[PDB]
Design a protein around this ligand. Structure first.
Ligand SMILES: CCCCCCCCCCCC(=O)OC[C@H](COP(=O)(O)OCC[N+](C)(C)C)OC(=O)CCCCCCCCCCC
Ligand SMILES: CCCCCCCCCCCC(=O)OC[C@H](COP(=O)(O)OCC[N+](C)(C)C)OC(=O)CCCCCCCCCCC
Ligand SMILES: CCCCCCCCCCCC(=O)OC[C@H](COP(=O)(O)OCC[N+](C)(C)C)OC(=O)CCCCCCCCCCC
Ligand SMILES: CCCCCCCCCCCC(=O)OC[C@H](COP(=O)(O)OCC[N+](C)(C)C)OC(=O)CCCCCCCCCCC
Ligand SMILES: CCCCCCCCCCCC(=O)OC[C@H](COP(=O)(O)OCC[N+](C)(C)C)OC(=O)CCCCCCCCCCC
Ligand SMILES: [Cl-]
Ligand SMILES: [Cl-]
Ligand SMILES: [Cl-]
Ligand SMILES: [Cl-]
Ligand SMILES: [Cl-]
Ligand code: NA
Lengths: 311, 311, 311, 311, 311
């Protein structure tokens, strides 16, 4: 089999559609997600045309091997789609209607800047390369683009599944490539992060501040160093669920800034003790009394600055 | 091969049955489980009918390629099933009796709200797409739906394996589809969670309460802080075995509430010390004496409420 | 090809044998193990019979596609067996000698009750479904059941590889199934657990008992709490290497009981301090002196009782 | 099919090109990376020559099985590449233009000496083995070597993708082999390591140096030991993300040297206390006062040297 | 196709050779490694013989299906090797020269006794089963056994790749099997273990010994207990990367013995405090002064002894 010939000099229009059946395994570190969907292809092949009245059969059904099917591939897939051909239907006029069910691991980058209050646009790029005979061009049949209502992605809210109707036509290795952009819009469910990471992390920090109502250097050293230790664990815990980035993330900024607070609390605790030993507890008392106010405030303002910069 | 033609205008009824041989790998974080089962299909194809007299055979065996087999797929599978054909038998009226052995990774959501005292309903959805020639409809042959007695799922009690007899017929990509719902009912074996997570977590909390029978600020700070850090370990330990949810979980609620108790115990420990230093240990003594009773009581009440809200 | 016809009304006897070449990957959590073995099949097909005198060839060699081979499957395999056929030999009387080399992931439950002093019986179930023409029955050719001397399973002692000679014949989906039980007997190599888990865990416990020869509450508090946290690590470390069970394990019981000892030691440490503060160190001295004997004695007695219950 | 015949005694030139579509999964520990690219191949087979007048078509399209294709393999791949032929075009003279889309896990060693400020040269080696009939030689068509603009590798900056135009021709197992070297130049994005590992590690170190402004042995022991323990945590965390090397890495050197600082701080803390107990706090005061300066200075000097040695 | 017939009653000699292209993934816990190599096979098949004069070619090239190829398998592989036939060449005297490129996961046990100063001999066992027609025997063509210079195994030094020239012939299920032993000799790169595990572990131990120059029970308790806690981490960290063995390893012995040192240091610290409280610090002073010497000496001696027992 060879491609259908052009009536006039026109490129072949392959109408495409992706219908999500299942979406799963959004790996933040790998910046990948798995998808299970229907891929629909429609093009016209005059060689396959027939008479409806004469033939009696409204539609003719073919096996993939029997007819010419355009070679459609995904740009951003990790491991090549396992495809199932569901049906091939030919109209009297020669309009072919192809439908396959596929599953693929899609590689699509993520913006972690606003984590865990981030939204993402996942991309699925369809591509076709032109043949020497004729040029192939992709189009979106919006009637055949969608998703099942039950499509869920653990820890995410699925906003929309749409296609950018206009293909990106470009030359690559001296042949035309027609690229289509399917978009899955999702927003992270930040709920869990509040009682699991955010609040426990604030409690340990407030506990460190009780050292501002104590004169016991030994108790203070324990309060500040221990609580400090809990933070490293939280800091570490998160890095593990995140890939290295060239920029700072929201949670990353909060976590880093909290380190400075522990460092300064240690300084205060050290200063207060030093003065007490130098028999000047009135200076020490002033610093401790100030810190009670300054820490919470500065900390408070700084977060406002951070949230402002990040959102 | 093409579908069997309708005698009158009727849709083709494909009788289905799933018999579980094995169930394994229930991944809580992935919300998936693996299954190994028999899939039985039965439909009438008059074209294959024969007379037992002239043939001398009560049944006829065919190779899959030789005859028309309805394209049955699973909706909620991750990695498309690997199938083995066990046997294809044709009765004299042309009644086909198909049997395959398959294995598949099924994606079915889980409700973690009552963890680890939760029960789940796992779903296996069978589907068939109608062809242009005729409509294909699924039915359940309850005689061919079951499970082996030895079917086990590690850390779970297998309640039942049943099918919702009435299919969900609907349109998708301008063709009708007949969807069937097979249900595997399971309940979590919470036993382990008691000596592994629950009890150790209560012991560490109760240990923090000995600070209510001590005047030593340094010992108390050590008592609370140390006990506190262990809570974090458990809190983390659990969450790593569980996915992010938009709602609170029973264990999650208990764990979060326990953080508040440590926070308040730190406050009491701080308050008691402050008063002792301000040369007013009679006030301090009252608060500490109240704490010995209030903490346990409030804890008992709050837990009651939580269990009430969750069950 | 169709099954060999019965001379009289007899079922077809397929003689089976499994010869282990390799055993590996015993996953405790998954309750699975991987196996690489020879599968031998032997049955009589009279249609294949010949003359040795005139043919000049004692044995005739066939390709799988050329002859009828019984469909033998494994009941308990996690995933698809790679199968490669080494040889098919036909004796003059028509006795077929099939030999394949396979590899499979077998799912077989484990009893963790006596961990790490447990022994297990791994099962490999062979099965054959009877055809409409004739009934197929499995048999064990003990001559062709064995294992290579070099077969090893990391962290386990391989006791025996035997077959239960009598098949389990039963009806399933209105046809006879013939099931065979191959058994791999193994016992865990508990050596490592002594210097890695058991002894370190006892040392930390004994270190907490030094608090019985100290009057320093702050010191005692530190001893007991610090030692305590290490136990959680061991407790935690261990449980991660295990699946959740509906029962208590030996190690699990020891670990849980040790928590009670820390809890009571904290109580004693608290009591001793309280009395010392209430200016009654003679009562405190009696309790501490009793504790020095009592803890070890009880601990020892408790351990004996448990061992008794578990073995 | 056999190789095309020489027209003089010349070896067959297979022109090659690799165009990266996707690069992902750079595993530092495994020293591997996954790639998804186009493999272009061009050779001349005069046996495929045709007159466009007779055939109708200016360019002929063949299926891989139909014609002779040079056996091109990758030297440094983990499992055999996943390949799909995009197109096979033949021009009238018999010039074949082969295009396949492949994905492979490439094993290429990494130099960790400058981690996390290291750059790497990833290699992809193409190879062809000569036949007894004629010798096959590889060449680079620079017009068909490149990468998509959107090619990204998480945590890395992609510098260049080039080919060493001159093949490495050599004898192996009494036949000629033509090897080509494709190079992917990348440099690590060290940003994250600063707020995640480097800075937290320095803060904890400086927290320990506050022991130089304290006379409390008990507080100092807590400061130095506690802070010390966190270092082990960071030290360990880092090791996990790196493989064993026969050399010392930049981060590894910093981490190791920091251990010495804790060891010496413990000595100072011990010395200071010993003198204080021996009723000679004036000597102790001198050492502590020196330490306040020497530690930071020495540390600083040492880092410059190492920084210097490594770069 | 059938095997080449014997001229006299001789067994068929299949000359073998393995040439390593790549070595990777040495999994210590799994006791496996992955290999990518050339497998060369050579045997005489007289039926394939020809005259160079008549034929006009001095070599004949066949496709695998066309001729009889001996069924060579690997004994110790996890899954059946991924093989691609590179070439099949026939000399005029019926000498067949087969070449395939394969990749396989080899299961070969490791001796951890001297870890991390251990050397290993990895085995690759080639095997052939004799047919009813004739007996097959393996031989090593040393000219075709080798490895690429660039072959590396992360964290290991590759010593040699050789073959035991004499096969192990034996009966298995009443057929002769010819087994060959290919050996890959490797020695572990212990470098990393010194600054990563060994030295940090000695530093924490030495820090615990500073308790011998302190009278502060509370300070001492903190020193020993804290440091002890670091030891568990190292002990735990190590055991995670190593399988359970029925014998002690070198590192395992050092780690275990160090536990005894902490246990005895706790006893000394307890004893010293007890005497101090009983108003007898002169006895306490003697024990502490002895400990300063006895601990280091004993420790030193014990390792010498151990080093001796292990090497
Ligand atoms: C620890 C320090 C406190 C951290 C709090 C961060 C929350 C935040 O400030 O994040 C803000 C986000 C919502 O942002 P958005 O909908 O993406 O807006 C994008 C649109 N623009 C472009 C107009 C900005 O969170 C929430 O809706 C609820 C916050 C609950 C967290 C309670 C604690
Ligand atoms: C920490 C504080 C204590 C936590 C204990 C929570 C147990 C619970 O409250 O859970 C209750 C569950 C059973 O619930 P169900 O079978 O789903 O009932 C659903 C039907 N309704 C809606 C009518 C209620 O557990 C048990 O039978 C035994 C658990 C014993 C735990 C001992 C400690
Ligand atoms: C910490 C608390 C101490 C734990 C020690 C319990 C080990 C045990 O007592 O276990 C006993 C087992 C043997 O059991 P079996 O071979 O299955 O006997 C089954 C047959 N019966 C029913 C007739 C008995 O271990 C051993 O051979 C030696 C263990 C050395 C432990 C050293 C520490
Ligand atoms: C703990 C002590 C501090 C450790 C900091 C080491 C960083 C360094 O000194 O490394 C320097 C490297 C650059 O090296 P290069 O580009 O490979 O040089 C190759 C060319 N030559 C051979 C001519 C030199 O990083 C950077 O561009 C910025 C590092 C900012 C880090 C701030 C903290
Ligand atoms: C903690 C206590 C210190 C641990 C040191 C153990 C190292 C060892 O003693 O082992 C020695 C091994 C080499 O042994 P081999 O090559 O197997 O000799 C086999 C031949 N025979 C049979 C004659 C013995 O390491 C080394 O080359 C250098 C190790 C330096 C480590 C410095 C720290
Ligand atoms: Cl694709
Ligand atoms: Cl499916
Ligand atoms: Cl099977
Ligand atoms: Cl390859
Ligand atoms: Cl093999
Ligand atoms: Na302390």
């Amino acid at each position: 089999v060879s491609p259908p010939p052009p009536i006039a000099d026109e490129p072949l229009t392959v109408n495409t559609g992706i219908y999500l059946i299942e979406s799963y395994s959004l790996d933040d570190c790998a910046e990948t997600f798995k998808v299970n969907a229907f891929l629909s292809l429609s093009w016209k092949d005059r060689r396959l045309a027939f008479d409806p009245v004469r033939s009696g059969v409204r539609v003719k059904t073919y096996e993939p091997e029997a007819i010419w099917i355009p070679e459609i591939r995904f740009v951003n897939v990790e491991n090549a789609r396992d495809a199932d051909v569901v049906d091939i239907s030919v109209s009297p006029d020669g309009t072919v209607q192809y439908l396959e069910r596929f599953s693929a691991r899609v590689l699509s980058p993520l913006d972690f800047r606003r984590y865990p209050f981030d939204s993402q646009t996942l991309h699925i790029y369809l591509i076709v390369r032109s043949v020497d005979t004729r040029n192939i061009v992709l189009a979106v049949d919006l009637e055949k683009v969608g998703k099942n209502d039950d499509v869920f992605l653990t820890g995410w809210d699925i906003e929309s599944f749409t296609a950018v109707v206009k293909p990106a036509n470009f030359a690559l290795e001296d042949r035309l490539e027609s690229k289509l952009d399917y978009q899955l819009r999702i927003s992270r469910q930040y709920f869990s992060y509040i009682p699991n990471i955010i609040l426990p992390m604030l409690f340990i920090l407030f506990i460190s501040w009780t050292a501002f109502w104590s004169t016991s250097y030994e108790a203070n050293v324990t309060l500040v160093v221990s609580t400090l230790i809990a933070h490293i664990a939280f800091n570490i815990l998160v890095e593990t669920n995140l890939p290295c980035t060239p920029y700072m993330t929201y949670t990353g900024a909060i976590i880093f800034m909290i380190y400075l607070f522990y460092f300064v609390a240690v300084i205060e605790v050290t200063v207060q003790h030093y003065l007490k030993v130098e028999s000047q507890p009135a200076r020490a008392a002033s610093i401790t009394r100030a810190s009670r106010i300054a820490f919470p405030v500065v900390f408070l303002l700084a977060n406002i600055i951070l949230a402002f910069l990040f959102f």
